[PDB]
Structure formats: structure tokens, C-alpha cells
Structure 1
Amino acid sequence: SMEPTLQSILDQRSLRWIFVGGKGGVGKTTTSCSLAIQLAKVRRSVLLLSTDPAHNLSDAFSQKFGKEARLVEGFDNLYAMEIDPIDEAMSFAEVLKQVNSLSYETIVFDTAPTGHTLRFLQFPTVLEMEKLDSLRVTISEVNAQFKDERLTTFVCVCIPEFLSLYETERMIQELANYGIDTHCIVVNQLLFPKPGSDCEQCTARRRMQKKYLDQIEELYDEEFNVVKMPLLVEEVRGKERLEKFSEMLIKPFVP
């Protein structure tokens, strides 16, 4: 059993590429932000980077963002940008490369669902004139970065419900197969009924969710920071609301 908190990612300075994965709408984006916001507080600079074809960085922050970096309003520290790149994975490689050797200390990546993330990792192994070798070279480098776990982890976002956790599983697992590190799970949108209330629906639900959770724990307790975040009444938008949510990431809502 480890802290149910991301404190550890705060602590691990080595980190250069933090990847947030999970299933469509489990709340990936929302975290990516929260996480950045939180790192942004304790790093020199943090670049938040969306690849998802539909970008919601902007929407999340209420702020037009481009393939051009820029300061996030209400910060001096944190930057965000939204771009889009057999062979789609090649344009992606290029971005990381150039970015990687940018003057940003840590990057939190947002992207197209476990799906693309997946195919891409697989790739290198796929390939198994001198520009042939030139490409090879760089991929190879990039891949190593990936396996180096001082430089790269994944956070797993998910909510309690069959189809999401089933990804988080496979995902964690391929991450294992490809020799890439990952030790956090943001289980999100938990419903805790407000104490003192009897309310069929909330009770019943906390029941149904609870069930999943317990599992998650039992499975992963010992090796994953398993973070628990409350499902808020309102969407999580605005620097303001996001800062707040992001707190919990770091110190457990425990009501």
C-alpha cells in the first residue's frame, strides 16, 4: 500500500514525459491539467501538450491555444499547446524529438485514446538509404527514453465501470510488456454520498462503485498510487476550478 496521492511525481524530478492515458471521457484531459497545474507549482516550467485531434485544453481553460506554445493565463510558469502530427506514428516521433530538447523542464502529454498510444509503442518492434538508418536511429533513441523510467511514466485515468477498468488493465499490461514504467492510477468521478444522507440512488451507486474500487485496491494497492477523486457537481473548468480539483490529486479527499 502506497500513498493514494501523486506526491511521488511531484517528488521525482527526473521526470520529463508524463503521459496521461485512459478511456474516452474518463477524464483524461481534466487530469492532465490538474497535474500540470500541480507540477507547475514546483518545477521551473511545465509544458502541457495535447495531441488529441479534438483539443480540449483550450475548452478546459477557456483559452484559445495553438501549435504555438504559450503561457497559461493566470500563471507565469505553465504552458500549453495543441497540435496534430503503417505510418502515422512517424509524425508523432518528430514532435517529441524536437520538443524533448526544449527548454521546458517537464512535459505532460494529453492524447488520442489508449488506442493510438498503443499502436505507436508497438511500432519500433514493427520495423525490427542511410535515411532508413537515420529514421531508425532516432526512433531507437526515443524508445529508450521511453523505457528509461527516470524520464517517462504513465498515469492511468479511469472511472469505476466495466469498460474503463478493462482498458486500464490491458494498458498497464502492455506498458509492462513494452518495458515502460507506470505506477499511478487516478480513479475518478467517485461518488461518495454526503454523510448523513439516506438517498437510494447515491447509496446504491456508492455500492456499485465501491465494489470496483475495493478490487482496484486489492489488485494494485501495493504498487500503484491509487488516487481517488470526487465527482463534482459542476464541470471542472476555469483555472480556478481546476486548481482546486488538482489539490485533491495531491492530498486525498478523505470525507
Structure 2
Amino acid sequence: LDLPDPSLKNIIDQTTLQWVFVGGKGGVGKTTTSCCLGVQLAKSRTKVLLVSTDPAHNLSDAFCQKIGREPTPIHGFDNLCAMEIDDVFGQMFNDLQNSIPGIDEAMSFSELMKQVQQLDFDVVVFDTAPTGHTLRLLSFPTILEKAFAKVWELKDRFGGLIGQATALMSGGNNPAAAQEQLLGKLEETRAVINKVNQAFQDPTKTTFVCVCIPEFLSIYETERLVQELSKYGIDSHNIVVNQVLFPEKDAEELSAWYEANGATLPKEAREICSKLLARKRMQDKYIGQCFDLYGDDFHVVLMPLLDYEVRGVEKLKTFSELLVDPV
């Protein structure tokens, strides 16, 4: 068969990329794959930044180095930085936060995008939260529009009280001035997120990498994420199937060898081979399902399951080579 290369080398080749997002369900290796992509991009690119919106501090444990809320240069690299992210006006803002769930996340994302675009980097890798939170990250514009419409509805409906009280309170508690400031903050956030989305819908600058493992839940969340990215016009052409058991041998070669030499093995080795072969068959079924869903338009990169955790700078550097050009 002729298919796209089973590696993430196309990410390194496309030198015009500015946003590289890495998504997937929790526990599939999002942080490790993101760190390896950052390590690989640090070679060709002048400046590379890694941004983690995962609530935990998995970036610090991954790089075996304390990573701050601001850019922290990665030990052993000259151009690789990391970053981990966790009164009338005030009352109206709290009413808006309570009425429209997700507006605070939208404003936090807007502030983060402004800070990152002002940090001036050539490429930013994005270790996102699990799929569920990334879907809200993608649905942010509808939340901003609902916030605008909620503010307008509140103004229209309570204009009588707002104007009658505007006469009373003085100084910096005018309900109309505070309401206009809330509208202006919503407008700032919406403009920032609109420019960011215009940059995101350009496959020249933005792409998405989906990480999964040969199990039902991971592939299901990967399909959810792919369909949502397709809906919102965000490009994705890389699926990383991690923790693959023995990505070199087939289930058939070793199954035949075992069927030919079954009675020659001790009880223990025979049980271990049988368990390993069964898990390999299940993983092969799920990899075939992946190749059915994708493969035509996606680079499917298979990564071997390792005994040790891929932590530390040197181990990550060695694993990135397995990521970008396999055996």
C-alpha cells in the first residue's frame, strides 16, 4: 500500500506552522508526545514554546524540571521554552459569569492568546486538556455571542431600574458606564478570539495532532475530536496511536510460531505468550479500526509501549526520534 508516512515528520517539514495543537483523552500520552514534538521543533525552528492548559502540572514531571506559569527555558535546549497554565461592574460581571457558563474560560483563553502572541515565538505546541475541555475551547464563539445577547437582554429588560438608579449613585458606579465597560470587555475578548480563530483555520499556520491508544474509549474520543475540528474548520492530519504492543511483529507470524511450538514451552512462558498475543490481537483490531476511519487522509504514527516512563530530557530526546522517523 501507498499511504502517508507513519511519522510526524510532515509537521517538521511544514516550516510555516505557528500553532501545533496536541489533543486526546487523558492518559494516552498527550504530555509526552507534546514534549517530544517541542523537542523536535526546537532543532529547525529559531524559537519554540510549549503551552500546557492541562489542569495538572504534568509538564514539570515530564521534563523533570520545574516549569513556571511564565516561559521557562528547557534544560539542555537554547531555543525551547515551556509554560504551564492551570461595584456595579463587578456585580454585573458576576451575573454574566453565572448566567453564561464558559465566559470566564473564554476570557482566560483570550488573555492567554494575547500573552502568547506578544511573547513572539516561531511555533507554539499546545498540550491541551482532555477532549471534553477542548470541545468547549472550540465552542467559545457561541458562548461569547450568548454573553453579548445576555448583556443586551439584561439592559433592555432592566433599563427602567438601571436608568432610575443611574440618577442616584455617583462616581464610578454608573450602571450604564459599567454596563458599557462590560460590553467593551466582551468585545475585546471576541475580537481577540476572532483573530485567533482566523489564524487557527489556516492549515498553513495551525494543525492538530490527535493522540490515542488501541482501546475503544481513546478511539471514540479521537473521532469526536476529529469531527469537531472538521466542523470548526481546523486542520488535522496526524493520528498518534501510542503504547502499541510490539509495533514490529504481526499477530499472525507469532501466532503461527506459537501454534507450532505451544507444547514445547513451560507453563509460565506459555501463559505469558498467550496473554501477550491476546492483547496484541485486541490492539490490532483497534488499529485496523483506526486505519478504517483514517489513513486515507491522516498520518498514522504507531508508538511502542515502554516499560519506563518517558521522563527526563534525554529519554524524551530519544523518544522523539522514534516519533518523527520510525524504524
The answer (yes or no) to whether the contact 2:247–2:303 under 8 Å persists in 1 is no
Partner of 2:284: 210
Residues 101 and 15 of structure 1: is their aligned pair in 2 closer, same or farther, counting only changes over 3 Å? Answer: farther
Q: Quote the Cα distance in structure 2 between the aligned partners of 1:35 and 1:210.
A: 25
- SS of the residue corresponding to residue 11 of structure 2 reads helix
Q: Which has the larger radius of gyration?
A: 2
The answer (yes or no) to whether the contact 1:193–1:203 under 8 Å persists in 2 is no
Partner amino acid for 1:226? V
1:27-106, aligned counterparts within 5 Å? 27-84=29-86, 86=101, 87=103, 88-106=105-123
The answer (yes or no) to whether the contact 1:193–1:202 under 8 Å persists in 2 is no
1:117-156, aligned counterparts within 5 Å? 117-128=134-145, 129=180, 131=184, 132-156=186-210
Partner of 1:250: 324
The answer (yes or no) to whether the contact 1:124–1:143 under 8 Å persists in 2 is no
Q: Quote the Cα distance in structure 1 between the aligned partners of 2:248 and 2:126.
A: 34
Q: Quote the Cα distance in structure 1 between the aligned partners of 2:77 and 2:288.
A: 38
| Partner of residue 229 from structure 1, selected from 303, 312, 323 | 303
- 5+ residue gaps, structure 1: none
Deviations 1:39-59 (A, max 9, x none): 111111110111111011110
Shift of 1:193: 7.6
- SS of the residue corresponding to residue 30 of structure 1 reads helix
Q: Quote the Cα distance in structure 2 between the aligned partners of 1:210 and 1:3.
A: 19
Segments of 4+ in structure 1 off by > 6 A? none
Deviations 1:36-79 (A, max 9, x none): 11111111111011111101111011101101212111111211
Deviations 1:18-40 (A, max 9, x none): 11100011110010001111111
Deviations 1:192-242 (A, max 9, x none): 188678511211111110111122113211110110100011111111111
Structure 1 vs Structure 2 CA RMSD: 1.7
- SS of the residue corresponding to residue 66 of structure 1 reads coil
Partner amino acid for 1:69? P
Using the TM superposition, name which of 93-102 and 241-250 deviates more.
93-102
Using the TM superposition, name which of 118-127 and 186-195 deviates more.
186-195
Deviations 1:52-111 (A, max 9, x none): 110111101110110121211111121111122x22221112111221232211100112
Tell me whether 1:113 sits opposite 2:167 in the alignment. no
* TM-score, L = length of structure 1: 0.93
Using the TM superposition, name which of 210-219 and 177-186 deviates more.
210-219
The answer (yes or no) to whether the contact 2:19–2:205 under 8 Å persists in 1 is yes
Q: Quote the Cα distance in structure 2 between the aligned partners of 1:61 and 1:148.
A: 30
Q: Quote the Cα distance in structure 1 between the aligned partners of 2:187 and 2:50.
A: 31
* TM-score, L = length of structure 2: 0.74
Deviations 1:143-191 (A, max 9, x none): 1111122111110000000111000001100000011111101100000
Structure having the higher helix fraction is 2
Determine what percentage of the aligned residue pairs are the same residue: 62
Partner amino acid for 1:105? D
The answer (yes or no) to whether the contact 2:246–2:304 under 8 Å persists in 1 is yes
Partner of 1:240: 314
Q: Quote the Cα distance in structure 2 between the aligned partners of 1:229 and 1:17.
A: 23
Q: Quote the Cα distance in structure 1 between the aligned partners of 2:203 and 2:142.
A: 19
Residues 183 and 193 of structure 1: is their aligned pair in 2 closer, same or farther, counting only changes over 3 Å? Answer: closer
Partner of 1:190: 244
Residues 202 and 182 of structure 1: is their aligned pair in 2 closer, same or farther, counting only changes over 3 Å? Answer: same
Residues 221 and 80 of structure 1: is their aligned pair in 2 closer, same or farther, counting only changes over 3 Å? Answer: same
Partner amino acid for 2:232? Y
Partner of 1:18: 20
